Amino acid sequence: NLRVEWEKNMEIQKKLHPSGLWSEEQAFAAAEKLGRPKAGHPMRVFEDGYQQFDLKPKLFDPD
Amino acid sequence: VAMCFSSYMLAAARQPNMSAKLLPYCILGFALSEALALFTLLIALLELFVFS
Amino acid sequence: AIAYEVTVNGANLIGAGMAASGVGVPAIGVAMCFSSYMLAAARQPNMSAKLLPYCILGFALSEALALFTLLIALLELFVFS
Amino acid sequence: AIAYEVTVNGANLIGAGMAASGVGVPAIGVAMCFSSYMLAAARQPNMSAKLLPYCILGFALSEALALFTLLIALLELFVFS
Amino acid sequence: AIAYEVTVNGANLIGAGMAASGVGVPAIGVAMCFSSYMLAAARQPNMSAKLLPYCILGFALSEALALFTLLIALLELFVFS
Amino acid sequence: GELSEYVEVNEKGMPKPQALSLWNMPYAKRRALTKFARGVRWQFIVLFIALYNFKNRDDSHLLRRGAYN
Amino acid sequence: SSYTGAALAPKSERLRLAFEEKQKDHQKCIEEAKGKGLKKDELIDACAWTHRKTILALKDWFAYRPPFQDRRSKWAEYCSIRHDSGSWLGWSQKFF
Amino acid sequence: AAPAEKPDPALDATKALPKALEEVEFFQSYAVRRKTGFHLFNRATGSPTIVGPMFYNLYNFVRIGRVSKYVCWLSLPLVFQRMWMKNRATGMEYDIDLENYAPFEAKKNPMHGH
Amino acid sequence: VYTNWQSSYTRLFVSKPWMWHPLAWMTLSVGIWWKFGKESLCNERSFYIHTHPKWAPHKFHTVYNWSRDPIKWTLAEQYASIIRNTNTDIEAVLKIKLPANAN
Amino acid sequence: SSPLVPVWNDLRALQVFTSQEYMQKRGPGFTNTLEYKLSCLNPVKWYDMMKVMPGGKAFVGTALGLALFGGWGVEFVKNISVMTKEKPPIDWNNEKLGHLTRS
Amino acid sequence: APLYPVLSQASLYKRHFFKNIKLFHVVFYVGAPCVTFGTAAWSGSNRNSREAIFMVIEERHGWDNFKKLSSHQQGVIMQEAAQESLLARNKGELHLP
């Protein structure tokens, strides 16, 4: 009860991410605090042989 | 399916000597009954893994 | 014309219940087999050995469709995002 | 074309009702086994001991499908946001 | 793409009826167990004592699935916001 | 029974009807029906489907090149 | 909206642009290794990946021969069918 | 075509269930126990339990085993290990910054892929 | 007394179709793998599909770590070893300008 | 299978026995007609009557029909779902790349 | 006057130990250590806990820093990671996908 009450109060005041979800603002703030690299998108869907069995692939588009 | 097989059971208990003559119908009742279950199941799995 | 693509994430977990409603409809047919085996043996105990194959044969098939009905709802969640 | 993702949080529960609605259909198959054992013993009391194992076996199997249906309803709520 | 999270508060209450619909299906099995035990007793009065244990067993235990069909709807409203 | 591509024969050498009798119509009508029939059913259906798709084939690759200008 | 239809560029142009993109992605790795001050063996360990990607694009380009024009291919164009104008037997020429 | 085969008694089914009941009777024969040292907690009604009176049979067979009765128990301390570590983890104090940066098996984490 | 059981495995194999069955099984399975699984899964051009969560769930006991990319660095080490064994120039590929199939 | 099997059997028997009735009606003299004299010089008839011969000639005829025409039939079946589809223009080879003086 | 290589009585006595085995004599005697120290109970728990532990470590602290620290603090951090994984606060305390 103590743990879940503290966790709920921190989820309410946004000092802690919600249960099961990665929050962007909190993750970026924690990275800036610890002086670590920021959470990027390291995946590569357009790598050779990742979506070959995918009937609905993803299209390359330079934004 | 179990309707067909229950019918086969009660027919055999009514008359054991007719156990073999109704066995072809015991198989024919299941094959083209389970097939309709498969056509429905075929749609539900065809509904996902081909449509984009 | 205009084109709005929408990705409804709720249908990931709606269809799970929609399939879950059907998982029990085979069970009433499953029990029909063993009820039949009971009453058939009550009519003729000596035949209970020859019908028991058809009893086991009658269960696993009738039970199977329930399992197939259960597959989609479990295929619906633990792979789709 | 434009792309709007939507995450419906309400869908965490709409399926749970359907999964709950399908838990009661096997109950008829559940009682169909005890009814069969009743009528079987009512036609042949001496065979009551040899059919009781089939009776317990059928109750569990019919009950399991209802129980399997229940897993979706309980799995749909306490983990999914 | 854009992401609109929505919280449908009405789905807190919609599902209550959806689960509620399945509460009366087990009643047919429950009454079936007695409809069996009556006819069995009319077939053999003397065996009425040995079937009564297996007459309340399925009685209360089919209602148990009805209880879990009902316990969700009552767990759906007075705790969820 | 009721096998595929199978037919019984009576003492007069005639085919016995399994489901339907069609030997009442005259020989001229039978020859009219069967002069163009074959022992092949699904290939004609596939051929008509192919002819429909050939009538409705695409010629965009020729439009880009200018065969219709 | 969207549509299921023909590829935009020809195969040859597609492979050419892919080879150019991998050339760029390899040149960037090489420039970064030079800015970092790496030797030959370290530059190899750095940019072997993009080198292999470029080599695979080059292999695809060399492997794809554009088709030759002849009466059979032109008739196949008119018929709007995928046709090999180098086979007397079709699917069995693979085994004959 | 008309072979006229007599019935073969070997193809009948009049021994499988008797043999299974013989095996089960051999099983239950080892459940016979004396009156001395007998105790069984009944239900609150006073009626017996289900699993209760069928523990003596299982442990009488464990008595006759040779290796499993000295090996299969070595996975049981691991249960208490989990019982203790779970209770340690239910209330473990953790860094908020590390929890927000590296949540374990959380959804929508781009470092995982989704 | 002569027996192929104890004196000739070849004649024993020839005289028993139920010994041919496992060999045909093996040949068919290997042919199936060669036709379908070889180029789609095992080739270097098609090896990143094992990182997919749908078609290869938890092939690495977890979701695939893309920040680390063990496949990339393993294969890069191997290509580097190939390049060092062949004494090939890295920058020779960048001096190429492919033409276009004009007209 | 379908329950129309006896219907199809009746129709097959109809056409077969009507063709035989026609042959009985026209009676002898077929060898004097022009149709027979052309079928004697027609390769389709040679192949069709060699198919039913013994000595593996059914296998020979079927495999020959495959090797000759069934490959084109497979290609045709593959192209049925290609005729209706949008395809790009053919990148005809400029026939300029490849020439190189000998040395 | 036996013309064959007669095998001694002690050699037969020893071979009988090897060929007089029964199926249960193999199954249970080799399955008990296997089931206990196998992928189910001990080795599985160890080797599958390690994956979550080192995932958590490489996410929170880093593998290089973890290798640089002492074995004691390494084990402490591993134990904390094990507790976080066993808890599974994000999965609703359930080890399912």
Ligand SMILES: CCCCCCCCCCCCO[C@@H]1O[C@H](CO)[C@@H](O[C@H]2O[C@H](CO)[C@@H](O)[C@H](O)[C@H]2O)[C@H](O)[C@H]1O
């Ligand atoms: C009993 C009397 C009945 C009266 C009714 C008769 C109606 C007959 C059907 C006519 C329909 C024609 O249908 C129309 O055909 C044309 C070609 O002809 C198809 O068009 C197709 O061929 C053209 C011509 O090269 C290609 O460029 C095009 O890419 C392709 O779509 C149309 O997609 C289809 O819509």
Ligand SMILES: COCCOCCOCCOc1ccc(C(C)(C)CC(C)(C)C)cc1
């Ligand atoms: C409800 O279950 C019914 C299924 O029926 C199974 C029928 O098969 C029974 C086989 O059981 C056995 C096992 C061992 C044996 C003996 C005693 C012969 C074993 C032996 C050779 C060790 C002495 C005999 C029967």
Ligand SMILES: COCCOCCOCCOc1ccc(C(C)(C)CC(C)(C)C)cc1
């Ligand atoms: C290989 O298959 C054989 C396995 O058979 C196992 C059967 O399991 C049931 C045995 O458990 C029991 C149940 C009841 C009882 C005793 C309690 C019969 C009732 C008693 C002793 C009070 C009369 C003993 C053991």
Ligand SMILES: COCCOCCOCCOc1ccc(C(C)(C)CC(C)(C)C)cc1
């Ligand atoms: C309901 O039954 C559950 C028990 O199942 C246990 C599974 O055990 C695996 C095989 O166990 C054996 C071992 C030996 C045997 C015998 C002794 C009959 C082997 C034999 C025939 C070689 C003597 C039978 C079964």
